[PDB]
Design an enzyme around this catalytic site. Structure first.
Site, PDB file in Angstrom:
ATOM      1  N   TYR A  38       0.870  -1.170   0.000  1.00  0.00           N
ATOM      2  CA  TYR A  38       0.000   0.000   0.000  1.00  0.00           C
ATOM      3  C   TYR A  38       0.914   1.229   0.000  1.00  0.00           C
ATOM      4  O   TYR A  38       2.017   1.188   0.551  1.00  0.00           O
ATOM      5  CB  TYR A  38      -0.858   0.003   1.250  1.00  0.00           C
ATOM      6  N   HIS A  40      -1.876   1.411  -3.276  1.00  0.00           N
ATOM      7  CA  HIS A  40      -1.912   0.880  -4.622  1.00  0.00           C
ATOM      8  C   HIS A  40      -3.153   1.404  -5.300  1.00  0.00           C
ATOM      9  O   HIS A  40      -4.048   1.968  -4.649  1.00  0.00           O
ATOM     10  CB  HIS A  40      -1.823  -0.651  -4.666  1.00  0.00           C
ATOM     11  N   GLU A  58      -5.715   3.549  -2.931  1.00  0.00           N
ATOM     12  CA  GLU A  58      -6.255   3.213  -1.630  1.00  0.00           C
ATOM     13  C   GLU A  58      -5.138   2.993  -0.613  1.00  0.00           C
ATOM     14  O   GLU A  58      -4.042   2.482  -0.940  1.00  0.00           O
ATOM     15  CB  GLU A  58      -7.170   1.997  -1.681  1.00  0.00           C
ATOM     16  N   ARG A  77     -10.376   2.154   4.235  1.00  0.00           N
ATOM     17  CA  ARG A  77      -9.404   2.809   3.368  1.00  0.00           C
ATOM     18  C   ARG A  77      -9.728   4.255   3.063  1.00  0.00           C
ATOM     19  O   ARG A  77     -10.899   4.627   2.979  1.00  0.00           O
ATOM     20  CB  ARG A  77      -9.360   2.106   2.002  1.00  0.00           C
ATOM     21  N   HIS A  92     -14.609  -2.375   3.524  1.00  0.00           N
ATOM     22  CA  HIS A  92     -15.161  -3.673   3.122  1.00  0.00           C
ATOM     23  C   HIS A  92     -16.277  -4.044   4.106  1.00  0.00           C
ATOM     24  O   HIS A  92     -17.083  -4.930   3.823  1.00  0.00           O
ATOM     25  CB  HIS A  92     -14.086  -4.761   3.212  1.00  0.00           C
ATOM     26  N   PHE A 100     -16.547  -3.015  -1.786  1.00  0.00           N
ATOM     27  CA  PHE A 100     -16.535  -1.985  -0.769  1.00  0.00           C
ATOM     28  C   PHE A 100     -17.884  -1.234  -0.693  1.00  0.00           C
ATOM     29  O   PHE A 100     -18.686  -1.270  -1.644  1.00  0.00           O
ATOM     30  CB  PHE A 100     -15.544  -0.880  -1.143  1.00  0.00           C
TER      31      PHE A 100
END
Length: 104
Positions: A38, A40, A58, A77, A92, A100
């Site tokens: 991350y 990404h 994110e 995120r 999520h 999401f």
């Protein structure tokens, strides 16, 4: 109450700003953290209506208030673009699979 409610997590605009700044700095430096690398690119398969321009990235925001530095990222995120503009805050939690839902 919460500027953002992700599942049962309550984030303030400052919480989101701190997470965003950490993710954008890695992005502009071209670096990442964690086994899942991350930040990404965030594809937006769910078709969220973001007003800022894509591409999007994110980056985990953590229930603890700490900045993500690796390990388990949890479900939340912050999504931002290459102009360091916040696109949205998603999770999520309450979605199925890799999908999401937007925090409220």
């Amino acid at each position: 109450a919460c500027d953002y409610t992700c599942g049962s997590n309550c984030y303030s605009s400052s919480d989101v700003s701190t997470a965003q700044a950490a993710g954008y700095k890695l992005h502009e430096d071209g670096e990442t953290v964690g086994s899942n690398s991350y930040p990404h690119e965030f594809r937006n398969w769910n078709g969220f209506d973001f007003s800022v321009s894509s591409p999007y990235y994110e980056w985990p925001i953590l229930s603890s208030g700490d900045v993500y530095s690796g390990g388990s990222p949890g479900a939340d995120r912050v999504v931002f673009n290459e102009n360091n503009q916040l696109a949205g805050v998603i999770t999520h939690t309450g979605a199925s699979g890799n999908n999401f839902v937007e925090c409220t």
